[PDB]
Amino acid sequence: PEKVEMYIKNLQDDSAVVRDYAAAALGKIGDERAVEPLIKALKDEDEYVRQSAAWALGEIGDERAVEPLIKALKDEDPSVRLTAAEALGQIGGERVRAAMEKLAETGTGFARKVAVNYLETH
Amino acid sequence: MMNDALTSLACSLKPGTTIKGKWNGNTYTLRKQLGKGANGIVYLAETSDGHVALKVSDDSLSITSEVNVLKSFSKAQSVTMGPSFFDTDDAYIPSANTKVSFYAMEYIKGPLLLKYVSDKGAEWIPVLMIQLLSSLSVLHQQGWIFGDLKPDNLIVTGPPARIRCIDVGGTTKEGRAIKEYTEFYDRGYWGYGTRKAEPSYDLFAVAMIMINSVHKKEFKKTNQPKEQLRSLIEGNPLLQKYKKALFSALNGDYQSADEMKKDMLDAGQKAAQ
C-alpha cells in the first residue's frame, strides 16, 4: 500500500536503523518499485544497510540487481560479501551463470571464488 | 532459581498469570517460560499490542542495570545485537509474597550461534564475530562491559544474518568486578588476566567464542593453557587464518573492540583480495 512508499522514503532517513529496517521490509514485501532504491542503498555508508539491501535484492529476484550485487562482492564488509554472494545464488539463472563465467575468468579473490564455486554447483 | 525469592517466584508464576505494572499500568500475560537464572526469570508474555520477552526478578537493582544496558544499545547510530527495550516497572506478586521488578523487551527467536554456523557454514563465524565486536564497541563506549559473553546467549536472526544477544544479565559497569562468568570464556580461568570489567575482558571472551564456534565443544584447561590454545588455533585452517586477532585478544594486546575488528577485517580482506 502506502507502506511500500513509506519504506522507500525511509531509505533516505538520517538514521541507519531506519534505513536498515526499510531495506529489509522492502525485501519481504517483494514489490518491484523497490529495486532501484535498494540498488542505491547498496552504496550506503552503513554496512548493515548494505547487507539488508543485498539480501532484499536477492529476495526480489529482479535481474537489474545482478551487476550491482557482483560489485558488492568487493565490499569491505564480509557480511555484505556473503549476503551478496547468497543473493546472486537466489536470483540464479543463465544471466548470473553468464556473469560468473566471466567473473571466474577475469575476476580475483572472493569474487572469483564465488564465481568458480557457482559454476561448480550448476 | 538461585535464591529463595527467585525460586519461589518461578514456582509462583504460571502461564495465564497476569502481571500489572505499578507505575505505568501495563498488563503482561505470561505464556511460557523462556529462561531461568540468577538474574531473573524470562517469559514470553502477551500484551494488548502483541508479544514481548518479560524478565522478572526480586532484585530491582539488577533489573534497573539491565534496563540501562538496553537503553545504551538503543542510543547507537546503527543497529546492534541487543533486543529493543519496551517497558520496566514494579509489581506485587501476592502468591510469592514479594515485590518484584521487571522489564519488557523485544521477543526474538532464531537458532543459537553454534547451530547457525553448523547449518550455514564456518565462513559465517568471523562475519558474526565482527558484528559482535561492533555491538560491543557500542556498549563499551557507554561504559558497559558485557562480562558473561557466551554462545548460549547468542542467536542469529534473519535473513539477513544478524547476531543477537538474548540476555544482558551480568553486564557490568566498566571498572567494577565481573562476578557473573563462565569458565571457558573467562580470562581468569585460563590464567590470562583479571576479572576487572574492561573492554579487553570481553575481547578475550570473543576469542573463546570463535574457538568454540569452530571446535563445536568446550574443554577444560590443562597445565599449559597457553600452549593448549596456541596448538588448537594453529592446527585449524579457519582459526589459523584469524590467528593475529585471536592471539591478540588472548594476550591482552587490545584496548578496544575496534582494534580486534580491524584485524579480523584485514585477515578477511587478504583472502578476499
- CB-based contacts of A52, cutoff 8 Å, min separation 6: A20, A23, A24, A27, A41, B160
CA atoms within 13 A on the CB side of B141: 14
Burial class (CB in 10 A: 0-12, 13-18, 19+), B188: middle
Q: Residue for cell digits 540468577?
A: B38
Distance CA B13, CA B146 (A): 28
**Is A54 within 8 Å of B265 when comparing Cβ atoms?**
no
Is there a contact between A110 and B188 (Cβ–Cβ < 8 Å)? no
- State phi, psi for B217 to the nearest 5 degrees: -155, 160
Is there a contact between B165 and B81 (Cβ–Cβ < 8 Å)? yes
CA atoms within 13 A on the CB side of B52: 20
Q: How far is CA B127 from the centre of its chain?
A: 17
Please tell me if residue B48 touches chain A, with a CB cutoff of 8 Å.
no
Three-state secondary structure of A43-64 = CCCCHHHHHHHHHHHHHHCCHH
Distance CA B136, CA B207 (A): 13
**Is A78 within 8 Å of B127 when comparing Cβ atoms?**
yes
Alpha helix positions (H), B75-158: 113-120, 124-141
Please tell me if residue A106 touches chain B, with a CB cutoff of 8 Å.
no
Distances (CA, A) of A119 to A58, A59, B37: 18, 21, 49
Q: How many domains does chain B have?
A: 1
Kindly state the cell numbers that stand for A116: 568458480
Partner residue facing B77 (CB), from A16, A59, A77? A16
How many CB atoms are located within 10 Å of the residue B38 CB?
16
Kindly state the cell numbers that stand for A88: 546472486
Amino acid at B86: F
Q: What is the DSSP string of A89-109?
A: HHH-SHHHHHHHHHHHHH--H
Indicate the DSSP class of residue B196: B
* B102 DSSP β-pair partners: B56, B89
Burial class (CB in 10 A: 0-12, 13-18, 19+), B224: exposed
Is there a contact between B95 and B131 (Cβ–Cβ < 8 Å)? no
* Residues of B recognised as catalytic: 148
Distance CA B96, CA B12 (A): 6
Range of the structural domain that residue B41 is part of? 1-273
Closest CA to B145 of B200, B193, B97, B185: B200
SS3 for B248? helix
* B173 DSSP β-pair partners: B144
Q: Residue for cell digits 523497490?
A: A34
Partner residue facing A55 (CB), from B78, B126, B160? B160
Is there a contact between B130 and B264 (Cβ–Cβ < 8 Å)? yes
Please tell me if residue B242 touches chain A, with a CB cutoff of 8 Å.
no
H/E segment holding residue B35: strand B27-37
- CB-based contacts of B151, cutoff 8 Å, min separation 6: B112, B113, B114, B209, B212, B213
Closest CA to A108 of A116, A97, A120: A116
Distance CA B192, CA B201 (A): 10
Q: Are strands B172-173 and B27-37 parallel, antiparallel or unpaired?
A: unpaired
Chain A contacts of B159, Cβ < 8 Å?
55, 59, 83, 86
Selected for mutation to probe chain A from B75, B78, B106, B116 (highest A CB count within 10 Å) is B78
Indicate the DSSP class of residue B34: E
First to last CA, chain B: 51
CA atoms within 13 A on the CB side of A113: 12
**How many angstroms is the resolution?**
1.6
Distances (CA, A) of B20 to A11, B59, B101: 38, 17, 11
Kindly state the cell numbers that stand for B214: 569452530
* CATH classification for the domain delimited by A2-92, as one of 1.10.357.10, 3.30.590.10, 1.25.10.10, 1.20.1260.10: 1.25.10.10
Amino acid at A59: E
Greatest CA separation for chain B: 64
Distance CA B178, CA B188 (A): 10
Chain A contacts of B73, Cβ < 8 Å?
none
**Is B272 within 8 Å of A24 when comparing Cβ atoms?**
no
Alpha helix positions (H), chain B: 4-12, 60-74, 113-120, 124-141, 199-215, 225-234, 237-241, 243-251, 257-272
* B54 DSSP β-pair partners: B43, B104
Domain boundaries, chain A: 2-92
SS3 for B55? strand
First to last CA, chain A: 38
B226-256: b or e for each residue (b if 16 or more CB lie within 10 Å)? Answer: eeebeeebeebeebebbbebbbbbbeeebeb
**Is B130 within 8 Å of A78 when comparing Cβ atoms?**
yes
